[PDB]
Design a protein around this ligand. Structure first.
Ligand SMILES: CCCCCCCCCCCCCCCCCC(=O)OC[C@H](COP(=O)([O-])OCC(O)COP(=O)([O-])OC[C@@H](COC(=O)CCCCCCCCCCCCCCCCC)OC(=O)CCCCCCCCCCCCCCCCC)OC(=O)CCCCCCCCCCCCCCCCC
Ligand SMILES: CCCCCCCCCCCCCCCCCC(=O)OC[C@H](COP(=O)([O-])OCC(O)COP(=O)([O-])OC[C@@H](COC(=O)CCCCCCCCCCCCCCCCC)OC(=O)CCCCCCCCCCCCCCCCC)OC(=O)CCCCCCCCCCCCCCCCC
Ligand SMILES: CCCCCCCCCCCCCCCCCC(=O)OC[C@H](COP(=O)([O-])OCC(O)COP(=O)([O-])OC[C@@H](COC(=O)CCCCCCCCCCCCCCCCC)OC(=O)CCCCCCCCCCCCCCCCC)OC(=O)CCCCCCCCCCCCCCCCC
Ligand SMILES: CCCCCCCCCCCCCCCCCC(=O)OC[C@H](COP(=O)([O-])OCC(O)COP(=O)([O-])OC[C@@H](COC(=O)CCCCCCCCCCCCCCCCC)OC(=O)CCCCCCCCCCCCCCCCC)OC(=O)CCCCCCCCCCCCCCCCC
Ligand code: HAS
Ligand code: HAS
Ligand SMILES: CCCCCCCCCCCCCCCCCC(=O)OC[C@H](COP(=O)(O)OCCN)OC(=O)CCCCCCCCCCCCCCCCC
Ligand SMILES: CCCCCCCCCCCCCCCCCC(=O)OC[C@H](COP(=O)(O)OCCN)OC(=O)CCCCCCCCCCCCCCCCC
Ligand code: CUA
Ligand code: CUA
Ligand SMILES: [Ca+2]
Ligand SMILES: [Cu+2]
Ligand SMILES: [Mn+2]
Lengths: 143, 190, 331, 576, 59, 102
């Protein structure tokens, strides 16, 4: 995490510079072959594009300032240091494919713009999302 | 030492995802600001800003920021291991966000009821696309809180369910922040 | 570039099929083109030669035969050479960009003095040309001539707001056509007639582009230049004007559409016909004298071929087109 | 470094079985429900190549209709739909999903991970990508046909008036769904890099391919939501009668800025992972390291940065953009893309090159992409683009680049990592037949179209008049296009044969000199990738694992300078 | 102590060590297991609960 | 506590671009890299202004464009070169203290 957090500051600096340059240039720089005025689409996109990298970079920096010296980021770590439980990872699940099909129903309901299709698509979507999130919580059957 | 503390993966994934909705709303800010530029070049933007109601939007904003601090108290309770506190504060958040969306609905019925529609002008289109995508994200946030509550109904409250709560709270903080940006651009910058 | 490219077969190879250019701006662009291709073929030669070296020299068979062993020298860094081959790209790119700025600003200026102005109006799917301004040294009657057609224009201006009260776009009607031009003398191209638009030689020309519906493109290969015709060019922030200092050689040249505009995008063609300066003066005088005279009548009136030579209309039959028959020979 | 005590009765792990032997009904329900990145990788790859053949069909039809002047069998509408959906299928249903498929199969192996961060999210990304493909291609099932506008979907040509048919809306939602898949895969790849690395593998011990997936994952994260927002703006105009994309609003250049801001980073998203694959392949079949590794990282990072500045070079002919800004920054994005060739030549420089099939494919990639990039820099000057924009010169450029990356280098990846996916080798005879058919076909198709465009043939032209003089060149181009289409016959047969009866891979690294960590495990890997991990002390762990005696050389010769690292004293206060 | 409830299924915890999990930080690399970290597996077939059926179908 | 240097026996040579003393982990390097990359925009502005004045264009404002270009290039250069050198301080003292260059 430590190394990877610093990298987001290269793009942030560069895109902030290009945003300010683009803005005051497009409002200031004269030309024969082009009109003068602040070009808002590129402006907003460049500033929020710097904001994305600033967000993720400052978050990962604020995280790594309070993590131990893990064997992953340690140049001479032994394999045996990572022994123990690693984490829970889903062995299988049907609900991703069901969500894809639900989104498909919704999207087709938009292209045809039948409102019942949009309704049913949103219900299929929210139901399958709930079932994905509730996959490992379904209580044991009881009489 | 018991174990080495390390990054919460689910929180990292959630921040990488909330990076996406910033750039989602970037395109809508572009569709707003180019339209505003042209409309002020005509000197006719302000013929529909007068449809707005800045006090109503301000009380709306109060409700949304209040819900945003409510779910933070809920996350405090979650990390303590306290499930009843989490239930309480997430429910109050659900209620305040529901109030937000139904007040936004009232404002929409008001603005449509006295002229401003999507097709009435370029202003109406930009207004409704921006504020409407935001309202859909708010409704998805209320759905997410509901799903968390039934999760801590069905399964036992472990650290896993706590992280599941923390990241829905991340999402609602982000939605609230996007409303701050919308509120200043729509009602004050105009 | 202001330097003439190499001569003979080298120049023909280097410009690689570019038109020669019937205007000074075109000559400049083609010169810059030829020279950057000299540079590009040099760079390609050296890099491809390195790849062919890697094939025919550094193989493993030849190394095993001459007793080189299992592995080669495991050199991972030459930090000075890394810096050198980082900056060499940069300092060749800098000269590329300097000459780019030069040639561009040569082409795209407005520091000229137009003596003819054309209003161009693309639509789905044809052209309408029209003479907007002529200089009194070249116009009928020896006076500066403005070609605006007052009533046909005043209708377009009146369209800005719909009196029925809709008016959604910043106060204007959706169907506002105010931005278009309606000159007096106009050459409306049709499905069966190519618009032959006539200009003088050795004369500054201005083109004033716009479209009635979608985005089109005024491309003339022999100017080595194109620009897009957008609807509401002011609102779209598009520079709608373009200027050439002169057209160097009389003739008849083709021009095409280059932005995909729809179904019949391949059928939008026109003929930029370039004639002697006095022949243009007589042409525009004749059409100023006969508001009901076709373009072909006036072309005949000054000895030109009546109809387009650089292209032709399209057959417009979805069945008969398939055997090769695609012109309709309306000439 | 500790020495573990050897123990009694030790036996190596049992190797898993190769493909072809699988018993009936084994894959059917597993495909529906699996969360394994390895199966999802194979599925991504097969799906992308299926769509590749489906888009090349439309391309062959286009090339047929241009063979001779006239409309011999297509109409105007159908030709427009054809080039539209060819371009769309080739970028969003081949390039991006195959990027993510190679990433999914290979990246957890390279970093020494068991699984991806969010497995069900991975599966969701795959299935939503397939749904997007269906959504796009169903426009052909309506009587009006697919979308007519090109894959750029300019405005107002895409609005409610000028394109009424529903095929356009099908295009919109399908492109959006492919964006959804691209972002889910990006979240997965990025978090998996951040969290689940093997002990010892810091960020600067990962392979080049992993670093490239890092930068393109953040690019995709940055750009695909903007595409979805702009496409929904278009759908908002069409279905709800909005006015934001009207030309009177300035809605044409609005769309162009939004689109190309998405769009050029997407072509870099396709380029960089396959630069990565080539950086994986060439060091193996050279018996050398990757030359300039850390500087190569900086090159990739600079491309990731600069990609956001150079977006509007696709708008020079508009008379709307700031020409000097974007021309300059385009010439700048070319430089770190140029450092790649110097690194690769350094890697092959006085190495011991064995010309196996994947190496041949990689060198074909370099030979084509060099010309593609030479063409691009001349598109990057406005005074040249004013003639070359929207000409067939531009078609020749972007095919010389994309066919270099997402086809040549992707086939190199297939031949390279077929053992790790199947435990079987591919047929080298057919591999070289496929290579040469592809080479002859592609060069003979697209090289002459440079001249066809320069002469003044625009792109997207259904028909032309024979007086224009294009006919001879179109004919040469079409014959070699049909040859290129025939190039896939040995490829399909080679994959199908070798998957089911190909030569069994007996060892963990059949090429012998594998660098990255995937070659330090079985062929195919177990369900959780690793039955044991080596020590990691280099960007090539498997090489120092297979050749201990080489480390002396590998470490000593690594730099040119006489730095005298071997002569230093003991640094730790104690070994404890 | 009673100044805030703590769930039964919460694990053992030392207040000097910070929370068992918090927004930025966890004690497991991947996700946290839904069965609790203080649970270990495999258990015995007895405490599994599962009763395996015996079936015979007529022929 | 902060970590101590890694143990290396006599005659061992590592590769460690992310070691603790390695500046590539130090963050001031990365900002300086960003500024070094940004410095080229000023040079672009200078070439633009000079070349546009050279052909008789932008004469109204070319001096200002060129001045902002050169000062942008220069301030970016000095800020980046010192953010870099600051970032590379620990490695310099490390090589001063110990035998390895790696
Ligand atoms: C590509 C698309 C793929 C779509 C796959 C759909 C899968 C949906 C869930 C199926 C569950 C399942 O695996 O069933 C049992 C069984 C697995 O058995 P198992 O191992 O015991 O696991 C059971 C699980 O615990 C699961 O059991 P559970 O306890 O979690 O509860 C399951 C139960 C929960 O439900 C209930 O209890 C009843 C309430 C139902 C109301 C739902 C409200 C919405 O589910 C249902 O009754 C079905 C609801 C599924 C909704 C999702 C469908 C979305 C629409 C997709 C199609 C639209 C495409 C449009 C595109 C075209 C454009 C127009 O699998 C099957 O029977 C598979 C049959 C279908 C295969 C599809 C092959 C396609 C080719
Ligand atoms: C209109 C007519 C609708 C009638 C539907 C059937 C009514 C019925 O049978 O009620 C008892 C029936 C189940 O009672 P039960 O004896 O627990 O049945 C066993 C279930 O199979 C298993 O049910 P369960 O125990 O899993 O369900 C309870 C669980 C899950 O329940 C839900 O998901 C609640 C739905 C919330 C709606 C939004 O509830 C929660 O976790 C509550 C969390 C807070 C919910 C949102 C609060 C927003 C303010 O109610 C529900 O399941 C929820 C009805 C909600 C209606 C809205
Ligand atoms: C909705 C689907 C519902 C389930 C449908 C179903 O029954 O699926 C299984 C069904 C048969 O499976 P099964 O019989 O239950 O399992 C035993 C198999 O015999 C066991 O078969 P296997 O695992 O030995 O191999 C079957 C299959 C393995 O499974 C698949 O291929 C499944 C992929 C499906 C996704 C495609 C979406 C479009 O592989 C092949 O057949 C050979 C490779 C095929 C591609 C090569 C031929 C040329 C076309 C592609 C161009 C080259 C691509 C380069 C690939 C390089 C790979 C490293 O096959 C398919 O789904 C066909 C696709
Ligand atoms: C309007 C848009 C609203 C979007 C939904 C709300 C976003 C914030 C949710 C916060 C969060 O991280 O939740 C998952 C997070 C995961 O906790 P966990 O179960 O401990 O998972 C750890 C496992 O390792 C998890 O590993 P796993 O990979 O096995 O599990 C997958 C699970 C795990 O979640 C993650 O890995 C979190 C990372 C980011 C998730 C976003 C994925 C990207 C989806 C594509 C982008 C769509 C753009 C539109 O992924 C999801 O829950 C995402 C499902 C896909 C959503 C696609 C919706 C787009 C429809 C397109 C039209 O928390 C929960 O599961 C809490 C329950 C409720 C969350 C979902 C609420 C659904 C709201 C309604 C949906 C739309 C109407
Ligand atoms: C994989 C996909 C693609 C890659 C990669 C790619 C690379 C480049 N392209 Fe591109 N392209 C353009 C320029 C470049 C440049 C500068 C590069 C760069 O990556 C090329 C640099 C790469 C190299 C590999 C350089 C060679 C290496 C070395 C080491 C050279 C040493 C020499 C130096 C440094 C000095 C240079 C001087 C010399 C004299 C050679 C431009 C404008 O400047 C347009 C729009 C113009 C228009 O609208 O007509 C464009 C349009 C497109 C389109 C749009 C087609 C559509 O509308 O559907 C696509 C899909 C595409 C794909 C791709 N393109 N490109
Ligand atoms: C990744 C990116 C791309 C690739 C690869 C690509 C490949 C080709 N291209 Fe292209 N393309 C053109 C020609 C070709 C040809 C001949 C090929 C060849 O590689 C295609 C041959 C490949 C094949 C592959 C054919 C064999 C077919 C088979 C094998 C079908 C059977 C299927 C199966 C699944 C059998 C097995 C069955 C099972 C069940 C397993 C031309 C002109 O000749 C234009 C200009 C259009 C115009 O009018 O301006 C064009 C336009 C474009 C555009 C712009 C579209 C637009 O204007 O909107 C893009 C982005 C693009 C990208 C790409 N293109 N191309
Ligand atoms: C789902 C569609 C949302 C509704 C948008 C729409 O087009 O509704 C039409 C309505 C006003 O239009 P009209 O047909 O004149 O109806 C009232 C006449 N008595 O619409 C309006 O003027 C109100 C718009 C409501 C919010 C729209 C949210 C947009 C979300 C984009 C994603
Ligand atoms: C965001 C993107 C911005 C990228 C910034 C580009 C400028 C590069 C500046 C890099 C600073 C390097 C500091 C460093 O890591 O030292 C070099 C390192 C030596 O290794 P070591 O002994 O482990 O050092 C430990 C700490 N120094 O390793 C080396 O000695 C190798 C370094 C050699 C130079 C790298 C060449 C990269 C070429 C990149 C092409 C980009 C083109 C466009 C930009 C050009 C800018 C001039
Ligand atoms: Cu056109
Ligand atoms: Cu066109
Ligand atoms: Ca034909
Ligand atoms: Cu581009
Ligand atoms: Mn264009």
């Amino acid at each position: 995490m430590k190394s990877s957090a610093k990298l987001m500051y290269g793009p942030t600096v560069f895109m902030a510079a290009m945003a300010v340059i683009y803005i005051f240039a497009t409002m200031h720089v004269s030309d024969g072959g082009s009109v003068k005025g602040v070009e808002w689409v590129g402006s907003v996109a460049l500033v929020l594009s710097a904001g994305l990298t600033l967000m993720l970079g400052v978050y990962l920096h604020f995280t790594e300032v309070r993590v131990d010296v893990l064997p992953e980021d340690w140049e001479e770590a032994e394999v045996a240091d990572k022994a123990g439980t690693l984490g829970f990872f889903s062995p299988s699940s049907i609900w991703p494919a069901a969500m894809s099909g639900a989104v498909g129903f919704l999207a087709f309901g938009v292209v045809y713009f039948h409102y019942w299709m949009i309704a049913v698509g949103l219900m299929l979507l929210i139901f399958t999302i709930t079932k994905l999130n509730l996959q490992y919580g379904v209580p044991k059957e009881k009489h | 030492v018991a174990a080495l503390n390390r990054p919460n993966m689910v929180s990292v994934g959630t921040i990488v995802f909330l990076s996406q909705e910033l750039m989602f709303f970037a395109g809508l800010f572009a569709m707003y600001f180019v339209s505003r530029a042209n409309g002020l070049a005509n000197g006719s933007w302000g013929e529909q800003t007068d449809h707005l109601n800045v006090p109503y939007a301000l009380l709306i904003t109060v409700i949304l920021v209040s819900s945003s601090v409510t779910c933070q108290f809920g996350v405090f309770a979650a990390e303590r291991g306290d499930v009843y506190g989490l239930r309480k504060w997430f429910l109050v958040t659900i209620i305040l966000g529901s109030i937000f969306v139904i007040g936004q609905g009232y404002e929409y019925i008001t603005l449509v009821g006295h002229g401003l529609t999507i097709q009435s002008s370029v202003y109406g289109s930009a207004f409704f696309i921006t504020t409407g995508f935001h309202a859909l994200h708010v409704i998805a946030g209320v759905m997410a809180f509901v799903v968390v509550l039934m999760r801590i109904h069905k399964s036992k409250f472990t650290p896993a369910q706590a992280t599941a709560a923390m990241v829905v709270s991340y999402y609602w903080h982000f939605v609230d922040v996007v409303w701050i940006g919308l509120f200043i651009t729509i009602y004050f910058i105009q | 570039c202001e330097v003439a490219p190499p001569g003979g077969v080298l120049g023909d190879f280097l410009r690689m099929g570019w038109p020669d250019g019937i205007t000074p701006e075109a000559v400049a662009m083609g010169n810059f083109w030829s020279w950057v291709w000299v540079a590009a073929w040099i760079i390609g030669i050296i890099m491809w030669g390195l790849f062919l070296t890697a094939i025919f020299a550094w193989g493993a068979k030849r190394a095993e035969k001459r007793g080189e062993g299992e592995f080669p020298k495991q050199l991972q860094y030459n930090v000075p050479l890394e810096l050198v081959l980082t900056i060499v790209p940069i300092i060749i790119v800098m000269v590329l960009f300097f000459f780019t700025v030069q040639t561009q600003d040569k082409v795209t200026a407005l520091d000229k003095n137009p003596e003819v102005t054309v209003d161009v109006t693309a639509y789905q799917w044809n052209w309408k040309f029209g003479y907007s301004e002529i200089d009194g040294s070249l116009a009928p009657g020896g006076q500066d001539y403005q070609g605006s057609d007052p009533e046909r224009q005043a209708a377009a201006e009146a369209s800005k707001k719909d009196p029925s009260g809709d008016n959604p776009i910043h106060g204007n009607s959706k169907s506002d056509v105010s931005y278009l031009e309606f000159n007096r003398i106009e050459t409306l191209g049709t499905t069966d007639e190519i618009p032959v638009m006539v200009l003088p030689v050795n004369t500054p020309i201005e083109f004033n582009l716009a479209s009635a519906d979608v985005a089109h493109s005024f491309w003339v290969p022999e100017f080595l230049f194109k620009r897009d015709a957008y609807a509401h060019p002011e609102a779209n922030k598009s520079q709608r004007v373009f200027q050439i200092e002169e057209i160097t050689e009389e003739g008849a040249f083709v021009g095409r559409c280059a932005e995909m505009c729809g179904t019949y995008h391949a059928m939008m063609n026109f003929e930029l016909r370039v004639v002697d300066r006095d022949s243009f003066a007589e042409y525009i005088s004749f059409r100023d004298s006969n508001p009901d005279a076709t373009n072909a009548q006036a072309l005949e009136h000054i000895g030109q071929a009546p109809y387009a030579t650089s292209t032709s209309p399209f057959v417009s039959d979805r069945t008969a087109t398939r055997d090769g028959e695609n012109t309709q020979s309306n000439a | 470094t500790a020495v573990a005590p050897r123990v009694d009765g030790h036996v190596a792990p049992q190797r898993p079985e190769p493909t072809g032997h699988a018993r009936k009904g084994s894959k059917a329900w597993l495909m529906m429900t699996t969360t394994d990145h390895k199966q999802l990788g194979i599925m991504y790859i097969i799906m992308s190549f299926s769509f590749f053949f489906l888009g090349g069909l439309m391309a062959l039809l286009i090339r047929a209709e241009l063979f001779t002047p006239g409309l011999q069998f297509l109409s105007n509408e159908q030709f427009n739909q054809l080039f539209t959906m060819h371009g769309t299928v080739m970028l969003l249903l081949y390039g991006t999903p195959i990027v993510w498929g190679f990433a999914n199969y290979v990246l957890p192996l390279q970093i020494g991970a068991p699984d991806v961060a969010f497995p069900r999210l991975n599966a969701f990304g795959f299935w939503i990508t397939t749904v997007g493909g269906v959504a796009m291609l169903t426009g052909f099932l309506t009587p009006g046909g697919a979308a007519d506008f090109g894959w750029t979907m300019y405005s107002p040509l895409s609005d409610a008036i000028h394109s009424p048919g529903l095929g356009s809306d099908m295009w919109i939602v399908g492109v959006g769904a492919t964006g959804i898949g691209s972002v889910a895969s990006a979240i997965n790849m990025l978090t998996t890099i951040l969290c689940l690395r093997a002990p010892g593998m810091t960020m600067f011990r990962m392979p080049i391919f992993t670093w490239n997936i890092f930068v393109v994952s953040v690019l995709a994260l940055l750009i695909f939501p903007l595409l979805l927002a702009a496409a929904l703006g278009v759908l908002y105009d069409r279905k709800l009668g909005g006015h934001l994309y009207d030309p009177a609003n300035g809605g044409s250049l609005l769309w162009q800025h939004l689109f190309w801001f998405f769009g050029h980073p997407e072509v870099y998203v396709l380029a960089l992972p396959f630069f990565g694959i080539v950086s994986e392949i060439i060091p193996v079949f050279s018996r050398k390291p990757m030359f300039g590794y850390v500087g190569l990282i900086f090159a990739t990072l600079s491309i990731g940065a600069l990609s956001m500045a150079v977006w509007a070079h696709h708008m020079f002919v508009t008379g709307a953009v700031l020409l000097p800004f974007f021309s300059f920054m385009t010439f700048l994005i070319s430089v770190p893309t140029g450092v790649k060739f110097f690194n690769w030549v350094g890697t092959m420089w006085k190495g011991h090159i064995t010309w196996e099939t994947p190496m041949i494919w990689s060198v074909g990639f370099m030979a084509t992409f060099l010309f593609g990039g030479l063409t691009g820099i001349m598109l990057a000057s406005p005074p040249l683009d004013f003639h070359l924009a929207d000409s067939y010169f531009l078609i020749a450029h972007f095919h010389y680049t994309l066919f270099g990356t997402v086809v040549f280098a992707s086939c190199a990846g297939v031949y390279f990592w077929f053992p790790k996916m199947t435990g079987r080798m591919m047929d080298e005879r057919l591999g070289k037949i496929h290579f040469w058919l592809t080479f002859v076909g592609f060069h003979g198709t697209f090289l002459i179209q440079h001249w066809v465009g320069n002469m003044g043939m625009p792109r997207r032209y259904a028909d032309y008049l024979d007086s224009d003089g294009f006919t001879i060149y179109n004919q040469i181009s079409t014959v070699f296009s049909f040859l290129l289409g025939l190039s896939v016959i040995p490829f399909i047969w080679n994959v199908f044969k070798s998957w089911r009866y190909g030569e069994l891979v007996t060892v963990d690294d059949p090429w012998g000199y594998g660098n990255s960590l995937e070659w330090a495990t079985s062929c195919p890997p177990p369900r959780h990738n690793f039955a044991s991990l080596p020590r990691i002390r280099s960007e090539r762990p498997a090489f120092e694992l297979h050749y201990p005696h080489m480390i002396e050389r590998m470490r000593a010769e690594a730099h040119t300078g006489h730095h005298d690292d071997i002569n230093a004293p003991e640094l730790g206060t104690a070994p404890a | 102590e009673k100044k805030h409830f703590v769930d039964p299924a919460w694990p053992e915890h030392n207040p000097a060590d910070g929370h068992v999990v918090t927004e930025l930080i966890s004690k497991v690399a991947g996700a946290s297991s839904p069965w609790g970290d203080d649970k270990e597996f495999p258990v015995s077939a007895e405490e599994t609960g599962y009763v395996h059926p015996y079936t015979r179908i007529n022929r | 506590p902060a970590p101590e240097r890694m143990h290396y026996i006599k005659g061992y040579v590592p590769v460690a671009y992310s070691s603790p003393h390695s500046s590539l982990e130090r963050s001031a390097t990365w900002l300086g890299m960003g500024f070094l990359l940004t410095a080229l925009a000023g040079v672009g502005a200078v070439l633009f202004a000079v070349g546009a004045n050279s052909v008789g264009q932008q004469q109204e404002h070319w001096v200002l464009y060129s001045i902002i270009g050169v000062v942008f290039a220069v301030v970016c250069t000095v800020l980046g070169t010192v953010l870099i050198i600051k970032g590379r301080a620990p490695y310099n003292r490390y090589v001063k203290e110990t035998g390895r260059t790696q």
